Amino acid sequence: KVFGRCELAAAMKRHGLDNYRGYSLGNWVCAAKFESNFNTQATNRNTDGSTDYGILQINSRWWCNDGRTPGSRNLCNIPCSALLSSDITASVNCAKKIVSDGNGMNAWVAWRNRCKGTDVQAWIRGCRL
């Protein structure tokens, strides 16, 4: 599923991310844009051999199992394919565990480099929230 901006904002808000560990909804939307372009099916291999899955590009090095990331963890206790569903629940509930890790949203390289410090509220402009 390829989400619309406001559509994604609203799903994210429903699922409890607006100001989750203090990150305004717009931070989550901006991250999602730059990680996946709002596409639940996005997959990208990392150089270390893990892969990033889904709307928030959650990595098989620590968070999910994809059956080919040797010597890695599965801290959200899911198959990585669950992160690719049209329903973002698993992605969201796993993002919550990630962003609580102590490094906050810096876990998302694209957030840090492209969202952080920016006018992230722009990402929810015009949405009926």
Ligand SMILES: [Au+]
């Ligand atoms: Au959720």
Ligand SMILES: [Au+]
């Ligand atoms: Au959802």
Ligand code: NA
């Ligand atoms: Na893993």
